[PDB]
Design a protein around this ligand. Structure first.
Ligand SMILES: O=S(=O)(O)O[C@@H]1[C@H](O[C@H]2O[C@@H]3CO[C@H]([C@H]2O)[C@H]3O[C@@H]2O[C@H](CO)[C@H](O)[C@H](O[C@H]3O[C@@H]4CO[C@@H]([C@H]4O)[C@H]3O)[C@H]2O)[C@@H](O)[C@H](O)O[C@@H]1CO
Ligand SMILES: O=S(=O)(O)O[C@@H]1[C@H](O[C@H]2O[C@@H]3CO[C@H]([C@H]2O)[C@H]3O[C@@H]2O[C@H](CO)[C@H](O)[C@H](O[C@H]3O[C@@H]4CO[C@@H]([C@H]4O)[C@H]3O)[C@H]2O)[C@@H](O)[C@H](O)O[C@@H]1CO
Ligand SMILES: [Cl-]
Ligand SMILES: [Cl-]
Ligand code: NA
Ligand code: NA
Lengths: 659, 659
């Protein structure tokens, strides 16, 4: 064995195979290499007959492992062997392990690959490293899937239906797969992931120039590897997360930095990345944005109201579209009858063309003067207002539809034909916004703006155009928000609509939501519930009880999203949000989410602590449970210590009225 | 133009293409052939270079159409042409169109196919027939996906969040796909499907011997056919459902019977199929089952209670398993404190071996005399009782695991290696049940039994073993239930746990739950909610408010499924179900669901009529809505007319207690 050594870590590298264990010396925990096949890496490539296989690079014909410096090991995997015995001559992989001399940090990097006459695709490296042993380690995998989840490495008590779906998923394909970085679907929103047990934690931060995928395996024994062979898996149930380097696409540095934290968990992991988020320039705090624009202070304690009039999907849709007098009346009722002190009114359906032509203010709905009357009223309440804007759609039912604004690829093929809301080439979108946004700001006296779709993901293609649009919007110094967002857009916006959870998502039945993104960025970006899954809808992510309680735990604002005809049905939830979530949201708005803990064995009772001096304890399940000190938290209940010393206690109640 | 005609239908067969249209002469409606490509059928097959190809069989070299009887037309499609212009020489498809001489019924049958040197896979025939024009036809597709759904052929008002997901789904791949018959996952539970508008309805009933798949297309314009080419779809948005004949697997008669109903909708389709269901022998009424066993009358008004002790997943799991004294105390509380008059108590965790060895009664939990004490108490209340039973699992964590009880496929490979709950070959399962089920019945004095997993689906492979098991369980004249069920199993059981909805399923954001299965079978099988998605859990299918109201509309019973530690949290929902659902369930238990209607434009207000004389109106949305005569139904409210004329009204309310 080769040993790299500093004060905190022992790195033990097998010179025959290239596998390495990591001894974290403060706690004595040893992270093993691949417990299944002793594979340092898993390479996917075509063979001589062109079919693609995955090989264990530790079975390569030649393996060179050598220490070059006191802290650097070079590894070369030369001529891998296929399962039949055929050799991929001319194929090689070079990697490096680099131990930091002072900190508990190990950089792992794929530095070179060579294809021969073969084609290389995926490299899992390190392969199945830093695993937890299911039901031996008590801990979790930590995954920034949108707002974030953890995946416990052991079976625990929970509701009988959830228990069945949980355990069953760890024995089928629901517990294995891959996730992509920086999208608004199923993927990750921060470039890191980790595992921890009762002794120590390890996380890995992907290099800023790279875009691997992340393979996950949640308590699965690898039966998926053997189902096509029709034999039973001989492996142990483990938890692992692996980087998937896309050798056929990766232009960046294929480097991941591992950080080892004794006695840490997902909270410690988030704070480690938070330092890295600042160095990368993503972190622009809400206090800095408030210095630049005092109207940012209209956000703390505001309910986000989406009034959906069938637009952008349809112009003047019968039964859905609102008149500007109706908009005015809804705003007035929210203030005068419902006594909402602070609100963000987002009117979806104010223009008579389809997006991306966000003009003119629709005459059929009342015209500019009546929209201005509604906006004037909201401004007199101190509310923020914005119309719906988007500069990326190109809709089939728009009479102005044109492919002139769409992007084509090298073959001349239209891109995004199957994604109507994101069809305009971003290099056009500042110019599309320039057509009317300034006329609308000037005429209505706007103090805020929401822009949708364009900033929901962060992909390389078109990012220059999107940055241009972002700079142009931010140059107005309005309180501005955007749909979903990503960390890269944090410097340009004050709030994100979303950054919570999809309803149907990989891992939903074998993970618990954790406020991983807000553990990093709550000080820098305010977020609200997503409009497709608002706090007034009952979905896989809960009803109003669960969603209101989680809002306070996680530090996001209320979203009430509705068609106008629904308004009277919203009053009770508007009032409950006004009385419970809004004061807490107002107090914690600018502060750091310092810690989050799960207090019950079924993870339903949680405690969050904010640097404003606020503590939120909530119980997302139906039975009351006791925590430390004998204090009992009711089902769908809360115990909130406010900065002013008041202790808000109570719970949600469902009652049956039988006339 | 070749014409088949009777008094009600005119069948117009084009003799160049083989496409046909059906004029329904009462209403004047013309059901069109494939509006996109004018394809009579879509054949998937390998080419000369072995690549999979989908061809329009109406472009074959030779097409022969001829009247071979007065009401029979024979069609033959010879030598299909690939997209590159090469000919699949020696491939032929023969079909027959047979018009009933009297009724509005048209048989369509694939009679012969010959592959030559190619390999045939799938045949949609008829292809894209009986379609609806999106936003012109105002009707729906009717799909018996589990309990059943309808998919409106137009956009309509609904909550803003649901509206965005709905409309967006009609433009991406969520609105196209295929479903399979008779599984417990995403599939169909009855072998029929259909479309209707304001003028008439058509449904196709699949031959009892065949097993096609069902292709759906819900208001999609076919962009999925063009994304890889990078061009915009030139086709119109439509709704269609096609049979997919699996030519490489199908050994049955590939026939579908189309029935035409002027002025009909999904209710009429279900009643038509009800006749065919009685003809096939699936239909055995609950009244006949009650005459054979009077204990069936312990089911009306009963709440189904599943006490989940971490079994069958684990034996004696800490924090989850219940002792038999604790079971006794739960039964005592449900009766004495919660005043539940009728109940089916189902205890998951009474044996000390893993299924499929359902014995002995666990000593660790207290032993036979303590389980007997608990079961005797429930019997003294009039409750039904069953332990958890399953004869199909083969678990990795069972010390008795063996592959000797598993099935192997034609290659000798183990089957269901990735499906642990259904690994035992059905032909072994009766012998496994024989090992203890009779002793448990005799010792405990049982009146009831539930058997799980084995009858959740109906597959051709293993049906003799399953039927052998069902005949064995049915021999004891117990009130017996099974998990999920299928129409084929209705003769052998009194109740199904399930036959409702998956949480995450294709078409969930573009369909509405409709009681299709119960419109057929409510008189012949009682169903209750699914244990994975019980009425006490908040899921994609709703909260307790939504699920209780839908229960009364659809005619199913309440399911409360809980770990023992949750029990105090169940009490409010048990009491609401006791007071609201149980009386209605009791009165409607034996009757026919005569009709179901959607009364609001957003499909949230619904009305169901039972032949008991009971009318259930309910509002599954948050805002009060008015129906005919100005009657207003509150949000999450109900209006019920009982058999004795009395009127029940009320609603659920969520409120916030703050100390
Ligand atoms: O299609 S799925 O079966 O659901 O598979 C998904 C996943 O694809 C999803 O990714 C995103 C999450 O919802 C959408 C699905 O397509 C995706 O988000 C959408 O992306 C758009 C940008 O391209 C928009 O942002 C869109 O939301 C905006 O556009 C219109 C207008 O107004 C609204 C909206 O109605 C506004 O919010 C947004 O919803 C699939 O890729 C993956 O394989 O699995 C997933 C399963 O859940
Ligand atoms: O895996 S998915 O992502 O959900 O893809 C599904 C679909 O796979 C599903 O099919 C069934 C529906 O839930 C299960 C998923 O695997 C399937 O049901 C299970 O089938 C078993 C019988 O074979 C059992 O009936 C099992 O329920 C029993 O087993 C244990 C023990 O006790 C409980 C249970 O815990 C009892 O209910 C049942 O859950 C996939 O096949 C299809 O292709 O696509 C779908 C995507 O939605
Ligand atoms: Cl959240
Ligand atoms: Cl239901
Ligand atoms: Na700003
Ligand atoms: Na029976």
């Amino acid at each position: 064995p080769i040993v790299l050594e500093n004060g905190k870590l022992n790195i033990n590298i097998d010179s025959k195979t290239g596998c390495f264990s990591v001894t974290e010396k403060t706690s004595g925990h040893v992270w093993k290499s691949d417990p299944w096949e002793n594979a340092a890496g898993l390479l996917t490539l075509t063979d001589s007959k062109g079919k693609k296989q995955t090989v264990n690079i530790s079975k390569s014909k030649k393996i060179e492992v050598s220490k070059t410096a006191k802290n650097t090991v070079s590894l070369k995997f030369i001529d891998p062997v296929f399962e039949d015995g055929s050799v991929a001559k001319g194929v090689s992989i070079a990697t490096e392990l680099r131990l930091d001399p002072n900190n508990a940090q190990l950089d792992v990097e794929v530095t070179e690959h060579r294809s021969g006459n073969f084609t290389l695709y995926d490299l899992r490296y390190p392969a199945r490293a830093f695993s937890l042993k299911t039901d031996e380690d008590k801990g979790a995998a930590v995954i920034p899937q949108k707002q974030g989840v953890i995946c416990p490495s052991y079976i625990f008590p929970m509701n009988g239906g959830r228990f069945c779906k949980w355990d069953d998923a760890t024995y089928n394909n629901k517990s294995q797969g891959s996730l992509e970085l920086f999208n608004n679907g199923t993927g990750l929103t921060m470039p890191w992931w980790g595992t921890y047990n009762e002794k120590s934690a390890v996380m890995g931060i992907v290099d800023v120039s790279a875009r691997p995928h992340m393979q996950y395996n949640i308590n699965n024994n690898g039966q998926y590897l053997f189902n096509a062979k029709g034999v039973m898996s001989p492996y142990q149930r483990i938890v692992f997360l692996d980087p998937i380097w896309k050798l056929d696409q990766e232009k960046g540095k294929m480097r991941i930095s591992y950080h080892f934290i004794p006695g840490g968990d997902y909270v410690d992991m988030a704070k480690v990345y938070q330092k890295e988020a600042k160095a990368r320039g993503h972190f622009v705090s809400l206090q800095e944005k408030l210095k630049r624009n005092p109207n940012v202070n209209k956000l703390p304690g505001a309910i986000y109201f989406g009034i959906y009039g069938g637009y952008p999907h349809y112009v003047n849709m019968p039964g859905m579209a609102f008149t500007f007098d109706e908009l005015k009346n809804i705003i007035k009722t929210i203030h005068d009858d419902l006594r909402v002190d602070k609100a963000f009114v987002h009117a979806w359906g104010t223009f008579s063309n389809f997006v991306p032509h966000n003009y003119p203010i629709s005459e059929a709905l009342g015209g500019p003067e009546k929209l201005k009357a509604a906006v004037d009223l909201a401004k007199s309440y101190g509310y923020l207002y914005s119309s719906y804007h988007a500069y990326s759609p190109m809709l089939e039912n728009d009479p102005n539809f044109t492919t002139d604004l769409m992007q084509r690829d090298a073959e001349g093929k239209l891109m995004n034909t199957g994604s109507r809301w994101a069809r305009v080439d971003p290099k056009f979108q500042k110019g599309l916004a320039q057509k009317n946004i300034e006329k609308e700001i000037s005429y209505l006296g706007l103090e805020a703006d929401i822009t949708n779709i364009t900033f929901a993901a962060y992909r390389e293609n078109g990012k220059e155009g999107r940055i241009e649009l972002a700079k142009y919007i931010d140059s107005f110094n309005l309180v501005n928000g955007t749909e979903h967002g990503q960390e890269q857009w944090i410097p340009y916006f004050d709030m994100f609509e979303g950054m919570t959870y999809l309803e149907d998502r990989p891992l939903s039945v074998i993970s618990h939501p954790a406020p991983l993104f807000n553990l990093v960025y709550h000080e820098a970006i305010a977020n609200f519930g997503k409009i497709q899954d608002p706090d007034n809808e009952v979905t896989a992510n809960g009803d109003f009880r669960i969603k209101a309680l989680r809002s306070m735990l996680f530090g996001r604002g209320t979203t009430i999203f509705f068609a106008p005809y629904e308004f009277e049905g919203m009053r009770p939830m508007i009032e409950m949000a006004r009385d419970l979530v809004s004061p807490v949201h107002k107090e914690t708005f600018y502060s750091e989410l310092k810690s989050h803990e799960y207090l019950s064995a079924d993870y339903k009772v949680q405690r969050s602590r904010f640097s404003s001096g606020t503590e939120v304890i909530a119980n997302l399940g139906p039975v009351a449970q006791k925590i430390e000190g004998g204090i009992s938290i009711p089902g769908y209940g809360y115990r909130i210590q406010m900065k002013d010393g008041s202790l808000k206690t109570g719970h949600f109640q469902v009652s049956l009225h039988m006339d």
